[PDB]
Amino acid sequence: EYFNIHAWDVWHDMISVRALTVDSDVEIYKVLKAMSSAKITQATTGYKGTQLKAMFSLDGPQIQNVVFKPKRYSRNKIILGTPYEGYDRHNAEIAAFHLDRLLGFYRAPPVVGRYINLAAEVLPVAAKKLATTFIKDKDENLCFYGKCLYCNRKEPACASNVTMEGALILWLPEKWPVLKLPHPWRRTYNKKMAKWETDSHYCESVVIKEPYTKGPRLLDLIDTSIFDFLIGNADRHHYEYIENENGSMVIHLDNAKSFGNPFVDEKSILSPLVQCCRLRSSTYNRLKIATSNENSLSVLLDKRLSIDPIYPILTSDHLLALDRRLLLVQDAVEKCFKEKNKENVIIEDHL
Amino acid sequence: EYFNIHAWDVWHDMISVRALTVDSDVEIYKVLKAMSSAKITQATTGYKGTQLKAMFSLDGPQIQNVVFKPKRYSRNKIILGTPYEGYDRHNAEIAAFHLDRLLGFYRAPPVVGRYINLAAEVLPVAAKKLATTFIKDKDENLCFYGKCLYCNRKEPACASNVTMEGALILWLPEKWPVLKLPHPWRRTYNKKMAKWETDSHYCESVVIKEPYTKGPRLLDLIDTSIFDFLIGNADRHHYEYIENENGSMVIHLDNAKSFGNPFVDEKSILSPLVQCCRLRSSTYNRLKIATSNENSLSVLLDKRLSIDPIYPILTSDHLLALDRRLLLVQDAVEKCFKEKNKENVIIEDHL
Numbered sequence A, B: 001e002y003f004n005i006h007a008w009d010v011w012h013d014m015i016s017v018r019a020l021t022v023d024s025d026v027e028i029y030k031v032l033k034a035m036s037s038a039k040i041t042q043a044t045t046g047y048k049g050t051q052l053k054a055m056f057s058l059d060g061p062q063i064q065n066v067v068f069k070p071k072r073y074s075r076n077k078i079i080l081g082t083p084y085e086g087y088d089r090h091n092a093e094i095a096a097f098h099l100d101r102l103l104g105f106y107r108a109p110p111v112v113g114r115y116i117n118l119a120a121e122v123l124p125v126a127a128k129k130l131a132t133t134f135i136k137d138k139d140e141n142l143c144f145y146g147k148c149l150y151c152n153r154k155e156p157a158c159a160s161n162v163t164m165e166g167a168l169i170l171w172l173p174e175k176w177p178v179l180k181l182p183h184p185w186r187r188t189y190n191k192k193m194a195k196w197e198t199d200s201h202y203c204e205s206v207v208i209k210e211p212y213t214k215g216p217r218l219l220d221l222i223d224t225s226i227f228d229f230l231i232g233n234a235d236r237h238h239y240e241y242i243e244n245e246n247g248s249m250v251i252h253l254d255n256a257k258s259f260g261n262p263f264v265d266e267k268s269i270l271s272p273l274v275q276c277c278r279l280r281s282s283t284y285n286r287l288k289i290a291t292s293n294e295n296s297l298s299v300l301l302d303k304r305l306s307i308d309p310i311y312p313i314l315t316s317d318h319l320l321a322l323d324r325r326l327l328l329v330q331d332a333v334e335k336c337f338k339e340k341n342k343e344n345v346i347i348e349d350h351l
Ligand SMILES: *[C@@H]1O[C@H](CO)[C@@H](O)[C@H](O)[C@H]1NC(C)=O
Pocket: A119, A161, A162, A163
């Protein structure tokens, strides 16, 4: 046969240091379709971390690994309490991935929803580490509770009979190693307050040490703080970035502790933008196109979400919260304009 | 089923007024693969034109028409006579299309090689106009001779038994009508000499009438004269262009009267560049990258031709003629710099 390109090669070749994904729907739909239908050849789970998940190896000329995040809540679950509470939301990863493309960031790895038949697809290729955590619930649904720091028998992820809904997230290829640093605006995760909550010229302190003095890092974190605020992710306490000879970029990896509460907008997430009053020019241009379109951000987002196999992805309240929070980002940007003047707020760094 | 895009929609959506094709191999291979395998639902031929060809309707949700150019020569045929002598070369269309992408022009419609079973695929859907020109040759191969101006029974295109090799070229969609004008540097097609062969300030005369006074038309013809010079196409006496509200572009349509002789370089093809000494900046930049790559233009071109079903497409002598002619282009440009200074020859028109 002729003119064949395999989806896993499409994924490996589309990454550059300033873009994980591309505008082409043909290329992305090609990758999502393969993630959606590829045979699972191995399945396991790990001891590190606090969240229950699995790792699937998908078939192909070369094997492609994905993270599998199971459904843990109904679509109408409300996550209150602490801004960080609870299990990762599989539908939030899907929504965040498409919103990252819609806003032109292109910094999130592909995510697809999928209904996994645990009996037919997982058990016949499961590692012992995963298989030994399968149990049944009170209604004889098939479940597993995994291994991880907080994983235990009383908190399983349960299928509906044997069919488990979840999200698949592509591994980045080995050519693109990921580095992790603490976020200057991370929270304390106790009762004390962080420095940025008490200090208000805190950005002046950040820009003094590297890597925030020169280069794209601080504008990336401001981009990502806008993205995290719109989805309600208050828990990027450590950020991750790729890097080569041509630069670096903070990536939107693991966005699942989001879309937990459609009734509150956590403006503290916007602290990098509000305190620094710097904004990358290309980001600003796309934000004003988004507010001046005749279709709101959420109308455009749900059109993209309607292609995913497990759609509906978000309830209408989260969609309207997006549009409300986009206006709040515009307001924060304008306040930076008032108090430092536009031509000192908008930075054209050609990214 | 999920994430489906049909190839004919990929073709219709990728065209803009300054690019018929795109850099994405995924999108282009998707279209080429469909051309390679699509069922032929209709076949005909016309009275207009000078060259024997057919028109095929390919199946799909919508019908997609292609021009079919049959093989007429061996790969190693040396075509002597006038610079424009002979039949259309089917393999030249394939090579010219991939070179158009390799050089970054993106002005050529997709072309694929294909082996056509005339008995099974063409005859049962052939219109009478085409069917009545089918004959057998002295070795009982199935052939057809068409109804064009020079088409006649003594000059048929013949298959091997019933399998006919040829090239398929996509029609532009109806949304992109093509307009034709005489080329200011066209030949006389007699033994008289054309005005540009006698005068040496001829370009000065061209730029005074429209559409050569302003806009992209003249730099397009200089681009296309470089492209035609590399492939040996001395027969673009009329050029064709697309146009809408955002501009216009001369397209590389019908490139088959090329690669006729790998040992002769007809420098008269470069007359628009040599006489005008203007060169679009982006074209110059890509030409300089092509000469400084560690892999020659012909090595990179043959790697792309190796995916086509009827490969080998060009003999190594035509591949090396490409590299030879690229240096001759550089010489002509450097001569323009010496006699008008570089910054009056390189025009940055942002195209
Ligand atoms: C679901 O459970 C029923 C029994 O209620 C069984 O008949 C059926 O085969 C199960 N379906 C799957 C996909 O396991």
